[PDB]
Design an enzyme around this catalytic site. Sequence first.
Site, mmCIF file in Angstrom:
data_model
loop_
_atom_site.group_PDB
_atom_site.id
_atom_site.type_symbol
_atom_site.label_atom_id
_atom_site.label_comp_id
_atom_site.label_asym_id
_atom_site.label_seq_id
_atom_site.Cartn_x
_atom_site.Cartn_y
_atom_site.Cartn_z
ATOM 1 N N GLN A 101 31.495 32.889 47.265
ATOM 2 C CA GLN A 101 32.727 33.156 46.513
ATOM 3 C C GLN A 101 33.966 33.005 47.373
ATOM 4 O OE1 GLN A 101 32.247 37.326 45.290
ATOM 5 N NE2 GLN A 101 31.175 37.638 47.248
ATOM 6 N N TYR A 122 37.842 54.811 40.960
ATOM 7 C CA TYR A 122 36.626 54.053 40.644
ATOM 8 C C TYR A 122 35.460 54.448 41.569
ATOM 9 C CZ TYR A 122 33.412 49.976 40.224
ATOM 10 O OH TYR A 122 32.295 49.146 40.073
ATOM 11 N N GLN A 123 35.693 54.529 42.889
ATOM 12 C CA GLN A 123 34.592 54.800 43.841
ATOM 13 C C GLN A 123 34.008 56.213 43.587
ATOM 14 O OE1 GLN A 123 34.389 51.226 44.900
ATOM 15 N NE2 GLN A 123 36.501 52.007 44.933
ATOM 16 N N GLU A 164 23.470 43.904 49.017
ATOM 17 C CA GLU A 164 24.673 43.071 48.880
ATOM 18 C C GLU A 164 24.331 41.600 49.153
ATOM 19 O OE1 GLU A 164 28.357 43.236 48.407
ATOM 20 O OE2 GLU A 164 27.826 41.087 48.443
ATOM 21 N N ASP A 204 27.601 48.503 41.514
ATOM 22 C CA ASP A 204 29.000 48.346 41.831
ATOM 23 C C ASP A 204 29.326 46.849 41.940
ATOM 24 O OD1 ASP A 204 31.621 48.622 42.698
ATOM 25 O OD2 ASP A 204 31.012 48.969 44.785
ATOM 26 N N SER A 225 31.390 43.070 40.655
ATOM 27 C CA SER A 225 32.545 42.473 39.959
ATOM 28 C C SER A 225 32.204 42.121 38.474
ATOM 29 C CB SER A 225 33.064 41.225 40.691
ATOM 30 O OG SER A 225 34.291 40.755 40.076
ATOM 31 N N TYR A 244 42.985 47.653 37.889
ATOM 32 C CA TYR A 244 42.017 46.890 37.111
ATOM 33 C C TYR A 244 42.704 46.534 35.780
ATOM 34 C CZ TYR A 244 37.978 47.773 40.316
ATOM 35 O OH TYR A 244 37.055 47.915 41.337
HETATM 36 C C1 LIG Z 1 33.466 44.304 46.243
HETATM 37 S S1 LIG Z 1 32.148 45.266 45.579
HETATM 38 C C2 LIG Z 1 31.296 44.119 44.514
HETATM 39 C C3 LIG Z 1 30.285 43.288 45.329
HETATM 40 O O1 LIG Z 1 29.203 42.714 44.572
HETATM 41 C C4 LIG Z 1 28.663 41.658 45.351
HETATM 42 N N1 LIG Z 1 27.721 40.888 44.527
HETATM 43 C C5 LIG Z 1 28.020 39.948 43.614
HETATM 44 N N2 LIG Z 1 26.889 39.466 43.042
HETATM 45 C C6 LIG Z 1 25.870 40.160 43.557
HETATM 46 C C7 LIG Z 1 24.417 40.127 43.379
HETATM 47 N N3 LIG Z 1 23.872 39.275 42.464
HETATM 48 N N4 LIG Z 1 23.696 41.000 44.113
HETATM 49 C C8 LIG Z 1 24.225 41.857 45.026
HETATM 50 N N5 LIG Z 1 25.559 41.924 45.250
HETATM 51 C C9 LIG Z 1 26.408 41.103 44.551
HETATM 52 C C10 LIG Z 1 29.907 40.908 45.757
HETATM 53 O O2 LIG Z 1 29.637 40.105 46.899
HETATM 54 C C11 LIG Z 1 30.876 42.069 46.046
HETATM 55 O O3 LIG Z 1 30.883 42.347 47.445
#
Ligand SMILES: CSC[C@H]1O[C@@H](n2cnc3c(N)ncnc32)[C@H](O)[C@@H]1O
EC number: 2.5.1.16
Lengths: 285, 274
Positions: free
Chosen positions: A35, A65-66, A110, A159, A161, A227
């Site tokens: 990304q 949010y957190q 992550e 958590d 996007s 947001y």
């Molecule tokens: C900023 S917090 C949201 C996080 O979700 C992460 N993210 C997006 N898609 C996925 C996935 N399929 N699995 C794990 N983490 C993800 C993104 O890299 C971002 O850091």
Amino acid sequence: AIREGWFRETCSLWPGQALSLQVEQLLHHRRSRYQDILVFRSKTYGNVLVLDGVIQCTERDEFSYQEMIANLPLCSHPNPRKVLIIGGGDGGVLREVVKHPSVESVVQCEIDEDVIQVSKKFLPGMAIGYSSSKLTLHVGDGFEFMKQNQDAFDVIITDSSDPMGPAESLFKESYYQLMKTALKEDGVLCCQGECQWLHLDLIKEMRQFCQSLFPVVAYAYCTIPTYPSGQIGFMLCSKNPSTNFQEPVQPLTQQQVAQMQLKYYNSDVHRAAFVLPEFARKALN
Amino acid sequence: IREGWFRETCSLWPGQALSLQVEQLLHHRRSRYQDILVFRSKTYGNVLVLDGVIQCTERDEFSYQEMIANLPLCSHPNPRKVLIIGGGDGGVLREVVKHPSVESVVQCEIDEDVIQVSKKFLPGMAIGYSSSKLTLHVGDGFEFMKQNQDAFDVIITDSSESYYQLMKTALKEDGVLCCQGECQWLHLDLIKEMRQFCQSLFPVVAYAYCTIPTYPSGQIGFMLCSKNPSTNFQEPVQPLTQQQVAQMQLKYYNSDVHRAAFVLPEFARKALND
Ligand SMILES: CSC[C@H]1O[C@@H](n2cnc3c(N)ncnc32)[C@H](O)[C@@H]1O
Ligand SMILES: CSC[C@H]1O[C@@H](n2cnc3c(N)ncnc32)[C@H](O)[C@@H]1O
């Protein structure tokens, strides 16, 4: 992306509207394997993390949010000891989860290690989560990861996007069934569940699907200026038919709220978070 | 309006801005009092802007209009005589007249051209002006307030310290008021000082808020004051049944929302209470 000193957030998921934030200094912009990552120092919101053009967090308001996404599920479980976070690159949810004495282990999955490295540098008040001895940090797609786990977690927090880019898999309906399988027999989950003023269609869909899987399904929301439309919600599901999400099974004392340095969440905020505007109440109920 | 978008900036919310995409400019004139801009937006319907600040959009006006009227009206056991200050678009009037207890609504609006623009471009709001309960008055609501003593059950200021004292005098012995009250994410220090000022004048003061995407930071609050030391703003003295919410065509307000509206994020609870 930054024009005449401002960053403007546009997205097809909230057409015809945009938040702009005034930029004091560009800090980062690089493309990871997954990304586009942009970080800037804003004039009035502290540092700002943007992924594929969508604002992820600002230092000024991230706390709502957190705190909510962590404490809504944790305080709705009588004894949450093993926790899964999916996503959470900035470390902020981790920061909140580990404040709980009952939590022994937090697994974070992550996908994009570049987000972690950027957040450690530019989001220090969130990325303090990574210094916890409770963390097991995992790499990969949360969707595929979820398949690995059965009857393992007290609490799963997603958590993420929005349902675009690498997060799209986390909005597949089979993902909810994967989390049900991953959860222990009386486990709970909380997912970023989008905005009731923007995505009521999606919210009603998610809820109907989850109701067919879980005996208890709820939607809660928090306010957060940066947001889209100034707020966002949370899908909550429990495998325990006795879970009442609206009334925290672990109410926090003011002593705990203070000690946990909470700026948004407390037990009445928890309760009120489930009280929706009439239009949303009607559509969901 | 630039490149098909209207961007709202203001020194009262520095370094942030809402933009709304414009489908068509509808109206742009300076009245005797202020700049009046109206446009059809792509996704929020028609939008009224006064001196560059968004006043309402047809898509989300219901939240603020329902809350500012029902918070005070449902916090009074029998509100019969009501005063609205401002209210040029007619929408608060529209919500107040739904109450069978209300016999008369006086509205004091300074700018007659807002009324004319609102009747043309905000028909869902300006429908308020068709009520037989209305007495429309022209002028500055501040100087107007001085004209009245022991007259109103409820005063609502639907606006674009001594004013609060004037409202106290204008209210009956057990009257209540509701004023647009500042965003708690933008001006918490001002909410704090206004609350303290009001607490020196009234036995019961509360702060409530509603969400509304198109005000700065996506919400706005309400100052509520009562001359009745027994008033409980948080628990509505006139609860509404589901039948009533249905009949009144409410899209935001109900009795549970009323109660939840006083539950503030910890930072604000702390600053206003501790
Ligand atoms: C900023 S917090 C949201 C996080 O979700 C992460 N993210 C997006 N898609 C996925 C996935 N399929 N699995 C794990 N983490 C993800 C993104 O890299 C971002 O850091
Ligand atoms: C659009 S609703 C807000 C209304 O408040 C009106 N207004 C602004 N200042 C005053 C004042 N001093 N007295 C009465 N109405 C006012 C504006 O003209 C607008 O119509």
